């Protein structure tokens, strides 16, 4: 049962001390270089972020002083022979005291102090990336020594020399000839020589620092060519740049069928763009124009992973390793806002273009169905349910109707939605269960796509209306001649056809097959891959065949019954298969090829 | 315009000055309590791990001298009305000096010192979890006031008081009435009061701390119920015990049909167990987008990023590994160099395990392949390395025409009895073996005498194309082999060219075939495997311009012989049967996609075919 020793017998009887928490660097450097960042090559990304922050600070200072704006760029150099990578910027610069304060202290960031000493939050607060003060020390996991050439931009400041080796001790000195800005020299480790190649650095910049506000040069060439098209006015940016941007973030070659540029910032300063791929069967998270994660399976729901684009926000909380704070107290609100906006955007797409949405729905229908089944809160399913499209029995085939518009013509007296899950419309329009509903003027929705039954059962409600399935409710031949025509038909097709009746709704089809077990009809369709032997499928399904006396084939069978008994049996077996093919019960007519070939040879014997 | 500002004009001018790296206490605490752990619920997990480490230290200390071992017990106490949670253990305990050295100094812990003091790294090195020294500070995320009582288990130690509000300043005093072990009092924040409920603590602990090496009690109630059966000898754990552990990780009420208890040490300290569910996987579940990572019996909750191969997502289990590196947030280092070796090693072991099961119980493996065979097909298609493709190919099972029905053969044994004179493997796709025997492709293939594989499941044909090679033998389908490799000439030639006149909009070239015996016609495609896949998933004039169907007829067949008199007796009916013959050959290829109009033309043809009877 319960056995606990919890008690409050402890008492305070000593003298209290007052001393600060101790904080050394021997273990902090080891943690940063061994157990801080999940992946190795993020160190030059952090260096580029620091350079961009310095350039932004210098630009703010220059525009505050109201003077000219000189050149400001980030230059990347990599010597393959020397095995070193050089990054140099022309930012504000750092003095002796500034170097000691920032570089020599763990987590002490001058960017945060600059932000606190800004007091406007509109000029350059959003462009400052550095917030933790540990970005620079990421270079110690790949370098045995780091050389920094930093000089402040003040009119009279002198350069300084900074040395370190990652062992918790740094030897700062004085340097001459250092130009304005900061120059960092990194000597790669023996095991980390892979960063000495230009291609790797180019890949890193394209992955992470491809949207830096300032020009970036690697060995003297500029390759950004992407000025953060999501940060400007959606009206200003054209549709031509959307295709090029989509092909980059999604790593695809097709075009986006839809373009949603969301910029309204209710919960957070969200600047996101969403694309829908054309290729029918993933969003890259950004923060202050710096990539966070390529996959980002948290900001968006799983069922919305089919879209592509980026989500950039300048106020989301980031982890120490510059990764998203998963499932934070505020991130969950972002997912609901993004899901609601995308759902609303999709609804507006259907109204403005029904045909385009129908093509879109038939391409990503499984994604919408996946969300409803996997959704937890009921009202969330209602918004996704509005995206579903179904064809009703009261409207001609080929046009899809939404669930919301289905209730528009629904009677006030009726309170439950009727849906039928069938492989195709031919079986649904002829099933006796639908005929029971067809007696009244009510309409029933038809579900054809796979997993529709699971989605409808999981949804269980729409617009305060209970979801209930129909299955859970429960010129012409003479009459005398047609009577014995079926009697012989049930002999040859006793195992397959349960019974044959009279049909007056066949314009040009000699027969149709109809089923009373649409639930088991999908079982018949699902057995087209495993164990579809002819001698077995008849018993598991047991369908009924309907024929019309107004067709030539049915009329012709009267004389062939007695004149050519051998041909009569084969022809009836052929016409029964044709009904299944027309009704869609068989995925492919491969089995009927064997008997059809042997039928035509004797059908033209006199010819 | 290549311009750069990189140069070497910089040079040293002055002399170096002695300096040492420093750290900001307030910023470090703020970062730890605000931007270190994604989940605010992991502070109790970190404190439980610390308590377990302390208990392990006490156990090692009291077995080193070989005296009586005291009881091991850990308490998780929560007060809803007070909004506080109490964590008490019976660990080694900390004196004032130990408290100021460990608690008062950021990132340094006695666990690393204890590990270095082992001098053996064989007794308690596998049970120590704390390695970063910042686990305790995770409590400040939800606590604005931390009260700690601790005292060492030394013979004559005294209790102490430890208070900290997370502001970087902590006060230490001497406390009376404290017993052996460390007791921690956490005062929850106003906005972080959700952790004051029993259910929250219970579900977080069951998420993170199921397999603690020592008993854990929530308000005096034991809540472990598991003993981490993946640690001891695999023969020690029984078959029934596997099911009990299966019901937790798999979150299902069924039983595992397979069990792979993997314990290797040469490439990595791996103690992993994998279960194969006995139930058929759900189609909806398969279309949606596995194993649980464990380190020192502590969950890493890194199920994402596919640590396990995607085609192996159908198995459930845990992968315990103590030598893997973790970041500060106690999470897996994503895209690490060492973690990629874990995926390759596990994949090879799982592939070998499935091969052994097939050789052990062939009948049982046949049912397993009929259920989870789609995963193997997907993996070969999605594989980026060629060598990986053949390894998964051993798990594929097919039946050939040589042996009777009911027995399945692997790709490896197929080449054993295959003739060594050709570097080709022949496979045929058909819904049934019976249909495969009577397929036109097999009939034309009967000229040669080689065994041919039969593919029945979906996407099986695409798997062979992606594999493209097995044991240095090419994979060529029957239809591919045909294209690459009585009626007189005068009567056949005029009919052969006449068909192209009416079938020009559908077919391109028609040739004579001497291999077909009981099939009027057949169609060959240069790349039929891609053609079938193109018209199946992604999907007449719009397709005939790219498909290029190379139809070919058999002069020996009666239908082709009958076309000679039919073309002359009534021109108006000959083209209808030719279209039907072309349609029949199209169906046998599997390239038919819209058979809605096929029945309409077929039924209409029979109207005037024999109406004079
Ligand atoms: N290239 C540079 N030019 C000027 N200052 C820099 C440069 N790189 C880093 N710094 C300074 O070093 C400090 C610490 O940066 P770092 O440790 O990389 O993390 P963070 O950028 O988050 O502060 C920052 O406050 C920044 O001002
Ligand atoms: N419940 C506890 N009992 C005894 N010692 C503890 C307890 N919790 C923490 N400690 C001590 O505090 C030190 C630092 O712990 P922590 O900051 O959690 O980092 P780590 O998890 O790496 O030990 C450890 O050396 C450990 O001895
Ligand atoms: F660049 Be630091 F990690 F904020
Ligand atoms: F548990 Be500590 F972060 F090593
Ligand atoms: K710093
Ligand atoms: K500590
Ligand atoms: Mg930074
Ligand atoms: Mg800890």
Tab-separated table of N, CA and C in Angstrom, chain A residues 262-359:
chain	number	residue	atom	x	y	z
A	262	UNK	N	1.526	35.028	-44.690
A	262	UNK	CA	0.942	35.451	-43.425
A	262	UNK	C	1.904	36.397	-42.717
A	263	UNK	N	1.418	37.591	-42.374
A	263	UNK	CA	2.230	38.582	-41.684
A	263	UNK	C	1.549	39.208	-40.476
A	264	UNK	N	0.255	38.972	-40.266
A	264	UNK	CA	-0.412	39.485	-39.077
A	264	UNK	C	0.187	38.846	-37.832
A	265	UNK	N	0.534	39.678	-36.852
A	265	UNK	CA	1.235	39.232	-35.649
A	265	UNK	C	0.338	39.453	-34.435
A	266	UNK	N	-0.565	38.504	-34.187
A	266	UNK	CA	-1.344	38.546	-32.956
A	266	UNK	C	-0.560	37.955	-31.782
A	267	UNK	N	-0.092	36.680	-31.845
A	267	UNK	CA	0.656	36.142	-30.699
A	267	UNK	C	2.130	36.521	-30.708
A	268	UNK	N	2.729	36.567	-31.896
A	268	UNK	CA	4.154	36.819	-32.048
A	268	UNK	C	4.393	37.440	-33.415
A	269	UNK	N	5.555	38.078	-33.564
A	269	UNK	CA	5.918	38.750	-34.811
A	269	UNK	C	6.251	37.685	-35.853
A	270	UNK	N	5.205	37.173	-36.493
A	270	UNK	CA	5.328	36.071	-37.440
A	270	UNK	C	5.415	36.637	-38.852
A	271	UNK	N	6.475	36.267	-39.571
A	271	UNK	CA	6.651	36.597	-40.986
A	271	UNK	C	6.913	35.277	-41.704
A	272	UNK	N	5.842	34.614	-42.134
A	272	UNK	CA	5.933	33.277	-42.701
A	272	UNK	C	5.272	33.237	-44.071
A	273	UNK	N	5.800	32.370	-44.931
A	273	UNK	CA	5.266	32.141	-46.267
A	273	UNK	C	5.080	30.642	-46.454
A	274	UNK	N	3.935	30.253	-47.009
A	274	UNK	CA	3.574	28.851	-47.166
A	274	UNK	C	3.324	28.532	-48.633
A	275	UNK	N	3.799	27.366	-49.064
A	275	UNK	CA	3.649	26.906	-50.437
A	275	UNK	C	3.093	25.490	-50.443
A	276	UNK	N	2.268	25.190	-51.437
A	276	UNK	CA	1.692	23.864	-51.633
A	276	UNK	C	2.338	23.249	-52.870
A	277	UNK	N	3.079	22.151	-52.738
A	277	UNK	CA	3.745	21.562	-53.906
A	277	UNK	C	2.751	21.042	-54.932
A	278	UNK	N	3.150	21.131	-56.204
A	278	UNK	CA	2.319	20.599	-57.279
A	278	UNK	C	2.378	19.077	-57.324
A	279	UNK	N	3.557	18.504	-57.097
A	279	UNK	CA	3.748	17.057	-57.175
A	279	UNK	C	3.065	16.397	-55.985
A	280	UNK	N	1.911	15.784	-56.230
A	280	UNK	CA	1.197	15.090	-55.173
A	280	UNK	C	1.953	13.828	-54.758
A	281	UNK	N	1.885	13.454	-53.471
A	281	UNK	CA	2.560	12.249	-52.976
A	281	UNK	C	1.912	10.964	-53.484
A	282	UNK	N	8.171	19.839	-42.658
A	282	UNK	CA	8.879	20.122	-43.900
A	282	UNK	C	9.175	21.612	-44.031
A	283	UNK	N	8.548	22.411	-43.173
A	283	UNK	CA	8.758	23.854	-43.174
A	283	UNK	C	10.052	24.167	-42.432
A	284	UNK	N	10.835	25.096	-42.975
A	284	UNK	CA	12.109	25.480	-42.381
A	284	UNK	C	11.886	26.622	-41.398
A	285	UNK	N	12.277	26.409	-40.145
A	285	UNK	CA	12.112	27.429	-39.120
A	285	UNK	C	13.260	28.428	-39.169
A	286	UNK	N	12.917	29.711	-39.080
A	286	UNK	CA	13.893	30.787	-39.110
A	286	UNK	C	13.666	31.717	-37.927
A	287	UNK	N	14.750	32.342	-37.471
A	287	UNK	CA	14.695	33.302	-36.375
A	287	UNK	C	15.691	34.414	-36.660
A	288	UNK	N	15.183	35.635	-36.831
A	288	UNK	CA	16.007	36.802	-37.140
A	288	UNK	C	16.855	36.560	-38.387
A	289	UNK	N	16.208	36.015	-39.420
A	289	UNK	CA	16.846	35.710	-40.702
A	289	UNK	C	18.000	34.724	-40.545
A	290	UNK	N	17.901	33.838	-39.556
A	290	UNK	CA	18.871	32.771	-39.338
A	290	UNK	C	18.105	31.462	-39.208
A	291	UNK	N	18.512	30.456	-39.978
A	291	UNK	CA	17.824	29.173	-39.952
A	291	UNK	C	18.010	28.492	-38.602
A	292	UNK	N	16.930	27.900	-38.098
A	292	UNK	CA	16.941	27.168	-36.834
A	292	UNK	C	16.902	25.661	-37.073
A	293	UNK	N	15.905	25.185	-37.815
A	293	UNK	CA	15.802	23.774	-38.153
A	293	UNK	C	15.093	23.640	-39.493
A	294	UNK	N	15.564	22.699	-40.309
A	294	UNK	CA	14.982	22.463	-41.624
A	294	UNK	C	13.642	21.738	-41.558
A	295	UNK	N	13.449	20.851	-40.581
A	295	UNK	CA	12.240	20.038	-40.492
A	295	UNK	C	11.127	20.753	-39.731
A	296	UNK	N	11.375	21.108	-38.471
A	296	UNK	CA	10.448	21.890	-37.652
A	296	UNK	C	9.066	21.237	-37.587
A	297	UNK	N	9.031	20.040	-37.004
A	297	UNK	CA	7.789	19.292	-36.849
A	297	UNK	C	6.977	19.726	-35.633
A	298	UNK	N	7.264	20.892	-35.061
A	298	UNK	CA	6.556	21.382	-33.883
A	298	UNK	C	5.685	22.594	-34.175
A	299	UNK	N	6.204	23.578	-34.915
A	299	UNK	CA	5.446	24.792	-35.199
A	299	UNK	C	4.186	24.505	-36.002
A	300	UNK	N	4.159	23.408	-36.749
A	300	UNK	CA	3.007	23.056	-37.560
A	300	UNK	C	2.535	21.654	-37.212
A	301	UNK	N	1.241	21.383	-37.361
A	301	UNK	CA	0.732	20.037	-37.086
A	301	UNK	C	1.266	19.023	-38.085
A	302	UNK	N	1.192	17.752	-37.686
A	302	UNK	CA	1.701	16.675	-38.530
A	302	UNK	C	0.952	16.604	-39.855
A	303	UNK	N	-0.370	16.789	-39.823
A	303	UNK	CA	-1.166	16.718	-41.041
A	303	UNK	C	-0.935	17.902	-41.972
A	304	UNK	N	-0.293	18.968	-41.500
A	304	UNK	CA	0.047	20.112	-42.334
A	304	UNK	C	1.493	20.081	-42.806
A	305	UNK	N	2.181	18.949	-42.644
A	305	UNK	CA	3.565	18.830	-43.086
A	305	UNK	C	3.705	18.823	-44.602
A	306	UNK	N	2.603	18.686	-45.343
A	306	UNK	CA	2.688	18.626	-46.798
A	306	UNK	C	3.014	19.976	-47.422
A	307	UNK	N	2.838	21.074	-46.687
A	307	UNK	CA	3.153	22.389	-47.228
A	307	UNK	C	4.641	22.677	-47.052
A	308	UNK	N	5.119	23.679	-47.784
A	308	UNK	CA	6.520	24.069	-47.756
A	308	UNK	C	6.628	25.581	-47.616
A	309	UNK	N	7.761	26.021	-47.098
A	309	UNK	CA	8.010	27.430	-46.884
A	309	UNK	C	8.882	27.627	-45.659
A	310	UNK	N	8.824	28.841	-45.112
A	310	UNK	CA	9.580	29.195	-43.919
A	310	UNK	C	8.663	29.918	-42.942
A	311	UNK	N	9.026	29.844	-41.664
A	311	UNK	CA	8.331	30.545	-40.591
A	311	UNK	C	9.386	31.302	-39.796
A	312	UNK	N	9.413	32.623	-39.947
A	312	UNK	CA	10.409	33.471	-39.306
A	312	UNK	C	9.745	34.336	-38.246
A	313	UNK	N	10.303	34.318	-37.037
A	313	UNK	CA	9.818	35.143	-35.943
A	313	UNK	C	11.004	35.667	-35.149
A	314	UNK	N	10.919	36.929	-34.737
A	314	UNK	CA	11.998	37.598	-34.026
A	314	UNK	C	11.819	37.585	-32.512
A	315	UNK	N	10.781	36.924	-31.997
A	315	UNK	CA	10.503	36.945	-30.569
A	315	UNK	C	10.305	35.567	-29.949
A	316	UNK	N	10.445	34.490	-30.715
A	316	UNK	CA	10.308	33.141	-30.168
A	316	UNK	C	11.503	32.838	-29.270
A	317	UNK	N	11.327	32.046	-28.210
A	317	UNK	CA	12.467	31.692	-27.354
A	317	UNK	C	13.257	30.538	-27.957
A	318	UNK	N	14.574	30.701	-28.012
A	318	UNK	CA	15.469	29.709	-28.584
A	318	UNK	C	16.288	29.044	-27.486
A	319	UNK	N	16.627	27.776	-27.709
A	319	UNK	CA	17.447	27.039	-26.762
A	319	UNK	C	18.895	27.524	-26.824
A	320	UNK	N	19.702	27.041	-25.874
A	320	UNK	CA	21.110	27.419	-25.840
A	320	UNK	C	21.847	26.956	-27.090
A	321	UNK	N	21.445	25.819	-27.657
A	321	UNK	CA	22.017	25.320	-28.899
A	321	UNK	C	21.362	25.925	-30.136
A	322	UNK	N	20.676	27.059	-29.980
A	322	UNK	CA	20.022	27.759	-31.087
A	322	UNK	C	19.022	26.859	-31.810
A	323	UNK	N	18.237	26.114	-31.038
A	323	UNK	CA	17.161	25.292	-31.571
A	323	UNK	C	15.860	25.658	-30.868
A	324	UNK	N	14.745	25.301	-31.501
A	324	UNK	CA	13.440	25.751	-31.035
A	324	UNK	C	13.118	25.195	-29.653
A	325	UNK	N	12.534	26.044	-28.808
A	325	UNK	CA	12.067	25.611	-27.498
A	325	UNK	C	10.797	24.787	-27.672
A	326	UNK	N	10.957	23.475	-27.837
A	326	UNK	CA	9.846	22.618	-28.228
A	326	UNK	C	8.753	22.598	-27.166
A	327	UNK	N	7.505	22.749	-27.617
A	327	UNK	CA	6.321	22.653	-26.761
A	327	UNK	C	6.414	23.588	-25.558
A	328	UNK	N	6.836	24.823	-25.810
A	328	UNK	CA	6.881	25.826	-24.760
A	328	UNK	C	5.478	26.356	-24.474
A	329	UNK	N	5.374	27.176	-23.426
A	329	UNK	CA	4.084	27.737	-23.044
A	329	UNK	C	3.521	28.672	-24.107
A	330	UNK	N	4.362	29.170	-25.014
A	330	UNK	CA	3.924	30.070	-26.070
A	330	UNK	C	3.976	29.448	-27.458
A	331	UNK	N	4.794	28.413	-27.659
A	331	UNK	CA	4.891	27.781	-28.971
A	331	UNK	C	3.584	27.084	-29.334
A	332	UNK	N	2.912	26.487	-28.345
A	332	UNK	CA	1.653	25.800	-28.617
A	332	UNK	C	0.599	26.749	-29.172
A	333	UNK	N	0.597	28.005	-28.719
A	333	UNK	CA	-0.328	28.988	-29.272
A	333	UNK	C	-0.023	29.268	-30.738
A	334	UNK	N	1.259	29.235	-31.113
A	334	UNK	CA	1.634	29.478	-32.503
A	334	UNK	C	1.085	28.397	-33.425
A	335	UNK	N	1.123	27.136	-32.984
A	335	UNK	CA	0.620	26.046	-33.815
A	335	UNK	C	-0.869	26.203	-34.091
A	336	UNK	N	-1.646	26.577	-33.071
A	336	UNK	CA	-3.076	26.787	-33.269
A	336	UNK	C	-3.338	27.958	-34.210
A	337	UNK	N	-2.576	29.043	-34.065
A	337	UNK	CA	-2.756	30.203	-34.935
A	337	UNK	C	-2.401	29.851	-36.374
A	338	UNK	N	-1.275	29.162	-36.571
A	338	UNK	CA	-0.864	28.779	-37.918
A	338	UNK	C	-1.849	27.798	-38.542
A	339	UNK	N	-2.327	26.826	-37.760
A	339	UNK	CA	-3.295	25.866	-38.279
A	339	UNK	C	-4.600	26.552	-38.665
A	340	UNK	N	-5.075	27.479	-37.829
A	340	UNK	CA	-6.310	28.192	-38.137
A	340	UNK	C	-6.157	29.059	-39.380
A	341	UNK	N	-5.015	29.738	-39.518
A	341	UNK	CA	-4.793	30.582	-40.689
A	341	UNK	C	-4.731	29.755	-41.966
A	342	UNK	N	-4.038	28.614	-41.928
A	342	UNK	CA	-3.957	27.758	-43.107
A	342	UNK	C	-5.317	27.164	-43.455
A	343	UNK	N	-6.089	26.765	-42.443
A	343	UNK	CA	-7.430	26.241	-42.692
A	343	UNK	C	-8.316	27.319	-43.301
A	344	UNK	N	-8.260	28.535	-42.751
A	344	UNK	CA	-9.035	29.639	-43.310
A	344	UNK	C	-8.585	29.965	-44.728
A	345	UNK	N	-7.272	29.947	-44.971
A	345	UNK	CA	-6.759	30.217	-46.311
A	345	UNK	C	-7.232	29.165	-47.306
A	346	UNK	N	-7.240	27.894	-46.894
A	346	UNK	CA	-7.695	26.830	-47.783
A	346	UNK	C	-9.176	26.975	-48.113
A	347	UNK	N	-9.985	27.390	-47.134
A	347	UNK	CA	-11.411	27.593	-47.382
A	347	UNK	C	-11.621	28.700	-48.407
A	348	UNK	N	-10.879	29.803	-48.274
A	348	UNK	CA	-11.010	30.900	-49.226
A	348	UNK	C	-10.561	30.490	-50.623
A	349	UNK	N	-9.613	29.555	-50.718
A	349	UNK	CA	-9.175	29.076	-52.026
A	349	UNK	C	-10.301	28.350	-52.753
A	350	UNK	N	-11.092	27.561	-52.021
A	350	UNK	CA	-12.202	26.845	-52.642
A	350	UNK	C	-13.256	27.808	-53.174
A	351	UNK	N	-13.565	28.860	-52.412
A	351	UNK	CA	-14.575	29.819	-52.848
A	351	UNK	C	-14.130	30.569	-54.099
A	352	UNK	N	-12.866	30.993	-54.146
A	352	UNK	CA	-12.382	31.746	-55.297
A	352	UNK	C	-12.126	30.853	-56.505
A	353	UNK	N	-11.815	29.574	-56.284
A	353	UNK	CA	-11.570	28.645	-57.387
A	353	UNK	C	-11.969	27.251	-56.911
A	354	UNK	N	-13.188	26.834	-57.262
A	354	UNK	CA	-13.660	25.513	-56.859
A	354	UNK	C	-12.937	24.408	-57.617
A	355	UNK	N	-12.711	24.601	-58.920
A	355	UNK	CA	-12.050	23.574	-59.719
A	355	UNK	C	-10.611	23.355	-59.269
A	356	UNK	N	-9.887	24.438	-58.975
A	356	UNK	CA	-8.508	24.301	-58.517
A	356	UNK	C	-8.441	23.597	-57.169
A	357	UNK	N	-9.362	23.928	-56.260
A	357	UNK	CA	-9.385	23.268	-54.959
A	357	UNK	C	-9.727	21.789	-55.094
A	358	UNK	N	-10.612	21.446	-56.033
A	358	UNK	CA	-10.951	20.044	-56.255
A	358	UNK	C	-9.725	19.246	-56.681
A	359	UNK	N	-8.909	19.810	-57.574
A	359	UNK	CA	-7.645	19.173	-57.925
A	359	UNK	C	-6.704	19.130	-56.727
